[PDB]
Structure formats: C-alpha cells, structure tokens
C-alpha cells in the first residue's frame, strides 16, 4: 500500500478482464485477487485503484500466459472520488504489469495513470507519460 489520498470506490471483483497498457506481449490480464485484503464470507475480492494486484495473464503469448504475475492497476472504468468532492472517471479499465518492488515491466506506460498509485509507487509515476 502506501498513501492513497483518495476516497475509495471499488467495483472490480475476481474474473475481471483488464487491458495491458505496457508493452510486454500479454494482451489481457485477469485478476485473481487483490494483495493485502481481508475477505469475508460471500464477498469476492473487490479492487480499487492504486492496488497491488495478483493476477494471471489471461491472453498473450504462451511465454506470458499461464504465468502468475503481479501488476498495479492504473485505471478503472468506474468513477473514483477524490477527497475534494471532484470525481475521476476513465473510458476504460487498465493495469500495467509490475514487479513486487514497484518497478514497472515495459519501458513505457501510455495514457494517464492514477495519482494515488504515484504516491504509493514512485517508479510508476516517473515512467508515466502524464499523471492525472
């Protein structure tokens, strides 16, 4: 985790398909679960933004796919609430594959990426083409 500095909205459970925005050769990643989450009876693990997610690669090359990888989820289709009463909402849901350290796999992340993520892991903001 880290410092998120946003009021939470989550609404991506297990089985979700998210786009891979970094060059890596994996076209789709599917979320298994959310890292550092405590789940309860009848409640699928829900994912916000900024989270370190454990995932499998659902589509890609055979060298990327049936691999269990970690990623950090940059964007989500769902609306996000800032602390200041202004809301963030991106046209799609995306994740970038990321090593557990915080350091991104791919040599460029394209589009905006969430500010809450930037705070939490520096290298993802540093690489980013823009931080919205």
Partner 1 sequence: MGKVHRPRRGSLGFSPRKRAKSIVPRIRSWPKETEVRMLGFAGYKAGMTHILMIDDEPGLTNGKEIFMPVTIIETPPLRVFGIRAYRMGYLGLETATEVIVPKLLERRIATLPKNYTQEMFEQKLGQLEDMIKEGEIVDVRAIVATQPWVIKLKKKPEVMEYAIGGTSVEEKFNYIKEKLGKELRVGEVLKEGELLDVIAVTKGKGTQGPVKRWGIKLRAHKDSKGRRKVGSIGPWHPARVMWTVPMAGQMGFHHRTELNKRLIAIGENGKLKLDENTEIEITPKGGFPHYGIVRSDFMMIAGSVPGAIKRIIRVRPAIRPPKKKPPVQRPQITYVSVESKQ
Partner 2 sequence: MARWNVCSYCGKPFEPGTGKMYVRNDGRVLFFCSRKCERYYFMGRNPRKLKWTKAYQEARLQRGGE
Which of 87, 129, 130, 132 forms a contact with RNA (CB under 7 A)?
87
Which of 76, 95, 113, 117 forms a contact with RNA (CB under 7 A)?
76
Q: Residues near 92 by Cβ (< 8 Å), separated by ≥ 6?
A: 19, 75, 77
Q: How far is the CB of 129 from partner 1 (least distance, A)?
A: 24
Locus of tokens 């705070």: 119
Q: Are 74 and 109 in contact (CB under 8 A)?
A: yes
37 binds RNA (CB under 7 A): yes
- Residues lying near partner 2 in the complex (CB under 8 A) are found at 79, 84-92, 111-112, 129-130, 132
1 binds partner 1 (CB under 8 A): no
> Left, alpha or beta for 63 (phi > 0: left; psi -120 to 50: alpha)?
alpha
Q: Residues near 117 by Cβ (< 8 Å), separated by ≥ 6?
A: 49, 50, 72, 73, 74, 124, 125
36 binds RNA (CB under 7 A): yes
Which of 5, 44, 130, 132 forms a contact with partner 1 (CB under 8 A)?
5
Residues binding RNA (CB under 7 A): 1-17, 32-46, 48, 54, 68, 70, 76-79, 81, 85, 87, 92-93
């Amino acid at each position: 985790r880290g410092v998120s500095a946003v009021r939470p909205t989550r609404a991506l459970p297990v089985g979700a398909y998210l786009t891979v925005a970094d060059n890596s050769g994996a076209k789709v990643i599917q979320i298994i679960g959310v890292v550092e989450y405590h789940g309860t009876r009848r409640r699928l693990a829900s994912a916000g933004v900024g989270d370190m997610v454990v995932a499998t690669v659902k589509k890609g090359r055979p060298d990327m796919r049936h691999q269990v990888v970690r990623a950090v989820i940059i964007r989500q289709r769902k609306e996000y609430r800032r602390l200041d009463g202004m809301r963030v909402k991106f046209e799609d849901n995306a994740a970038v594959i990321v090593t557990p350290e915080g350091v991104p796999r791919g040599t460029e992340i394209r589009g905006p990426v969430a500010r809450e993520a930037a705070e939490r892991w520096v290298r993802i903001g540093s690489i980013a083409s823009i931080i919205v």
